[PDB]
Design a binder for this molecule. Structure first.
Ligand SMILES: OC[C@H]1O[C@@H](O[C@H]2[C@H](O)[C@H](O)[C@@H](O)O[C@@H]2CO)[C@@H](O)[C@@H](O)[C@@H]1O
Ligand code: NA
Ligand SMILES: [Zn+2]
Length: 377
């Protein structure tokens, strides 16, 4: 049966429309597991060509949702090209999402001392990057490259590969140049809308669903989520990102569930897909060598028990850095099939999460892209 969909891009390809329809249905039957750099970064992988993952080595299947970033698309592509690996993920029926760690359009010529000129350069650049602003051409250059990438991202039959494109995330904090100290809510909304319009209307991107993802709220209300929300005309996917303590984390887990419940209820009301677009133990705790060997079991237990939170389409955890990060300190979220994670109980935790009937990995999702749809618009 053909389902009626209303997308940000009413001219989206049939496969893109199908992806939306798939998640609309699937989300009330499972939660898909997502992983950033699934087949491009791992502690246990010997090839980064898109054929291996730490997830696969841990549980025998890939993540259902594959996350990557504009750090692999926009010059200087610090994270490396991902076209081949995206194509491999799509060929095995996976779902692709790309987040936007854009450089700072006001300061990107000044790179040298980290974090100058990067997403993490907190110099406000929202006002300055909108049309009329001096750095609008710099932002447009980034968007040009995203569009060229999207417009040429084709499968073996020459059809465009759908991507869930997540823009200006974690915007309710101030660690990024598009954050809440860097912009009024109206200015942020304009940046998001301008960028979607540029991609869709100026550059003709037809294979994107658009995702919005602030941080978790501690005062979990619709009014709070709506303050910087770009609007129903501009967003297909309602998400949030949340990172918590490794220890004494019951309150944080309740907050995860509350935020997921909110986005799920909002998504049903607004005809959107609710997701958790980024979730994990906070990086500093992992980097200190700490672990919670019940983390994944607590996550799935809490989510599936709640009648609203359970309705999210996916949750995504962050990258498994093969050599960690400079402190080298560990920086990974999927427990690896190796002595350290066997011994500390985290591998068992993740294997139990995989075994859970409500989690969906890559072999658990079928006919994602061939569903008939009608479009409103
Ligand atoms: O891959 C881009 C950088 O990602 C960082 O990880 C952050 C991420 O920026 C988000 O804030 C959220 O997902 O939390 C993640 C973990 O703290 C780090 O992995 C950097 O090393 C990357 O360059
Ligand atoms: Na679900
Ligand atoms: Zn159903």
């Amino acid at each position: 049966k053909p389902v009626t969909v209303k997308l940000v891009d009413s001219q989206a390809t049939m496969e893109t429309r199908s992806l939306f329809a798939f998640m609309q249905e699937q989300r009330r039957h499972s939660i898909m597991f997502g992983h950033q750099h699934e087949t491009t970064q791992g502690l246990t992988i010997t090839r980064t060509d898109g054929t291996q993952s730490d997830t696969f080595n841990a549980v025998g299947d890939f993540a259902a949702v594959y996350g990557w970033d504009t750090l692999s698309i926009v010059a200087p592509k610090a994270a490396g090209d991902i076209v081949a690996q995206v194509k491999k993920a799509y060929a095995r029926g996976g779902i692709i999402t790309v987040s936007s760690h854009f450089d700072n359009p006001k300061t990107d010529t000044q790179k040298g001392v980290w974090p100058v000129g990067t997403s993490w350069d907190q110099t406000p650049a929202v006002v300055d990057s909108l049309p009329g602003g001096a750095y609008n051409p710099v932002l447009n250059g980034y968007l040009d490259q995203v569009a060229e990438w999207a417009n040429n991202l084709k499968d073996e039959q020459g059809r465009l590969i759908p991507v869930i494109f997540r823009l200006y995330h974690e915007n309710t904090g101030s660690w990024f140049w598009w954050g809440d100290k860097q912009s009024t809510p109206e200015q942020y909304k304009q940046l998001f809308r301008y960028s979607v319009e540029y991609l869709r209307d100026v550059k003709g991107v037809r294979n994107f669903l658009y995702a919005y993802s602030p941080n978790n709220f501690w005062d979990v209300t619709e009014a709070n989520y709506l303050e910087r929300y770009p609007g129903d005309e501009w967003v297909d996917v309602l998400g949030f990102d949340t990172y918590g303590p490794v220890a004494d984390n019951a309150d944080w887990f309740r907050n995860v569930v509350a935020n997921a419940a909110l986005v799920a209820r909002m998504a049903e009301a607004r005809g959107k897909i609710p997701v958790i677009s980024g979730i994990g133990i906070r990086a500093p705790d992992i980097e200190a060598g700490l672990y919670d060997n019940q983390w994944y079991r607590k996550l799935i237990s809490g989510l599936k028990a709640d009648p609203d939170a359970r309705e999210i389409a996916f949750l995504l955890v962050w990258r498994n850095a093969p050599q960690g990060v400079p402190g080298q300190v560990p920086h990974y979220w999927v427990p690896a099939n190796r002595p350290e994670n066997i011994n500390n109980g985290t591998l068992e935790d993740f294997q139990a999460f995989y075994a859970d009937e409500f989690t969906a990995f890559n072999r658990d999702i079928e006919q994602v892209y061939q569903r008939p749809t009608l479009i409103v618009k």
